[PDB]
């Protein structure tokens, strides 16, 4: 059956510096991870590799508690992540999220 495994993209609390340090070593654009921001408690950040840069997206929450980056809302970080596997996380370029390797 569909193997029940933890998600390899949740790195918990790690500095923005170590995530950039780790993701710059990734082979493919879209390589990403969700981290718990240390700039403010309970906030999450999405770090994605693109070219020789690592882009950081802040995960926002609305009045009902849903998550979002731009306009579409998600009931979980899990659905937000999967959504951006097939729809770009970026406004300026097409960047699709893909698992680290």
């Amino acid at each position: 059956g569909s193997h029940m495994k933890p998600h390899p993209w949740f790195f918990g609390k790690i500095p923005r510096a170590k995530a950039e340090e780790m993701l710059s070593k990734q082979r493919h654009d879209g390589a990403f991870l969700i981290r718990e921001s240390e700039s403010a408690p309970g906030d999450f950040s999405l770090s994605v590799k693109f070219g020789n840069d690592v882009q950081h997206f802040k995960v926002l929450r609305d009045g009902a508690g849903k998550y979002f980056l731009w306009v579409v809302k998600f009931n979980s970080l899990n659905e937000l992540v999967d959504y951006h596997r097939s729809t770009s996380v970026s406004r300026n370029q097409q960047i699709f999220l893909r698992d680290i390797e």
Binding site: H56, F57, K58, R91
Partner: peptide, 7 residues
């Protein structure tokens, strides 16, 4: 900073 506007 972050790529997407935060407010």
């Amino acid at each position: 900073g972050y790529v997407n506007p935060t407010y």
